[PDB]
């Protein structure tokens, strides 16, 4: 089964923190963690220790807020 | 006089003590508070240093005049409590040029030593002149040797720059 996931965490770059919430399709949460690390590392030059994941919770395909995922879910 | 890239760094020791420094000069700057000095305003627009600096008194005075003229022409004395917080204590010296024989500089001026995230100057204002206070901020920023950034402070000690900027 292809579920849907919502991630909430914090990341630090050059001294300052910043929180984030994201949404993902997947078969697990391990894949979610890996992709989150890669994406934030590319887009803000942040290593994996300065990313702090607080929650990876499964959700529904209608309480989503990201057009791409909302549509890939339909 | 000489460029400020010579004197902006903070790597030399402090050189302040008047009872041992011979031939030391007097301050060109003499006024440090302006406007209405008791009015109990609301908003505090303050400048902070990004990294450590030595600011000369020539620059300090230029900023004084510019900012106060803007504020007097577009706010009016009965508002806009303006203050410069830092006094110039450090003595700048230059080598009287022989060559490098007996090199130990003679005094030429003064500067103020400012540390990382240290308030330089403040403008206290009311709700409906924030934009003019921020103009003063920008004019000042343009005349310093290194970079700075401004904050907006409320009573009770809180930072409100985000939203107060948003609503305008």
């Amino acid at each position: 089964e292809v579920k849907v996931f919502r991630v909430k965490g914090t990341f630090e770059r050059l001294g300052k923190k910043q929180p984030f919430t994201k949404e993902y399709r997947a078969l697990k949460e391990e894949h979610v963690r890996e992709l989150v690390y890669s994406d934030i590392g590319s887009k803000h030059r942040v290593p994996r220790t300065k990313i702090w994941i607080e929650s990876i919770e499964e959700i529904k395909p209608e309480e989503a807020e990201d057009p791409v995922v909302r549509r890939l879910s339909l | 006089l000489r460029p400020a890239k010579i004197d902006r760094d903070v790597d030399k020791p402090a050189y302040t003590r008047r009872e041992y420094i011979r031939g030391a000069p007097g301050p060109k700057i003499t006024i440090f508070d302006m406007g209405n000095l008791s009015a109990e305003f609301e908003y505090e627009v303050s400048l902070h240093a990004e990294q450590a600096m030595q600011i000369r008194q020539n620059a300090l005075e230029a900023i004084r005049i510019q900012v106060n003229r803007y504020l007097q022409k577009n706010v009016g004395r009965s508002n806009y409590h303006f203050k410069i917080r830092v006094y110039p204590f450090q003595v700048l010296r230059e080598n009287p040029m022989n060559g490098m024989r007996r090199p130990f500089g003679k005094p030429i001026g003064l500067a103020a030593r400012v540390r990382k995230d240290q308030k330089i100057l403040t403008v206290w204002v009311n709700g409906q002149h924030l934009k003019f206070a921020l103009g003063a901020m920008h004019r000042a920023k343009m005349k310093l040797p290194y970079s700075a950034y401004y904050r907006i402070y409320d009573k009770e000690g809180n930072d409100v720059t985000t939203k107060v900027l948003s609503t305008m």
């Binding site: 057009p67 791409v68 549509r71 890939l72 | -």
Partner: protein
């Protein structure tokens, strides 16, 4: 990205036929064929119930802009084989009335500012020029050809050496395919 399957659709009108073979789009109407190459990686064009569809599968902003540019072009081709396009030009002169003639694939302007030498302007294949009094009309099916012919005629009369407030003689555009020009 913006979305996942950007899809634009153009409906064909009464008597038009669109062929799509190999990055080349071909349009037939009452009047003349029309061809155009439209290629970009990831962008596809094909035909539906009646429609022309342009489609991309995970686009960025620039890709969106390109899809909609292509759409604009196809619509102009269709409107052109359906009706056509026509531009309008006006002639003004203080002193020295200039004679404008159509002879071959060139427009000839003489007595411009008093010059003994005539200026010349190219006419691109498939565009018709008419001259009625102080007015010129440029009509055809291809929008780019029509506009280019008109711009040629207008640039054939250009002044760099004197103040254009006082010296205003020339030929100027006043209407591009319907929408008039205003300051």
């Amino acid at each position: 990205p913006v979305d996942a399957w950007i899809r634009e659709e153009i409906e064909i009108p009464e008597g038009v036929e669109v062929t799509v073979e190999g990055n080349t789009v071909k349009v037939k109407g009452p009047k003349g064929e029309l061809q155009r190459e439209l290629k970009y990686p990831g962008v596809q064009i094909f035909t539906e119930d009646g429609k022309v569809v342009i489609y991309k599968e995970f686009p960025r902003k620039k890709d969106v802009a390109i899809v909609r540019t292509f759409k604009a072009h196809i619509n102009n081709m269709i409107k052109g084989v359906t009706e056509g396009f026509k531009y309008r030009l006006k002639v003004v002169y203080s002193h020295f009335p200039m004679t404008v003639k159509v002879q071959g694939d060139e427009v000839v302007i003489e007595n411009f500012l008093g010059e003994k030498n005539p200026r010349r302007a190219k006419i691109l294949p498939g565009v018709t020029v008419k001259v009625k009094g102080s007015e010129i009309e440029v009509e055809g099916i291809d929008k780019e050809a029509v506009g280019q012919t008109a711009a040629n005629i207008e640039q054939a009369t250009r002044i760099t050496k004197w103040d254009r407030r006082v010296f205003q003689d020339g030929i100027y555009i006043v209407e591009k395919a319907g929408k008039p020009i205003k300051f």
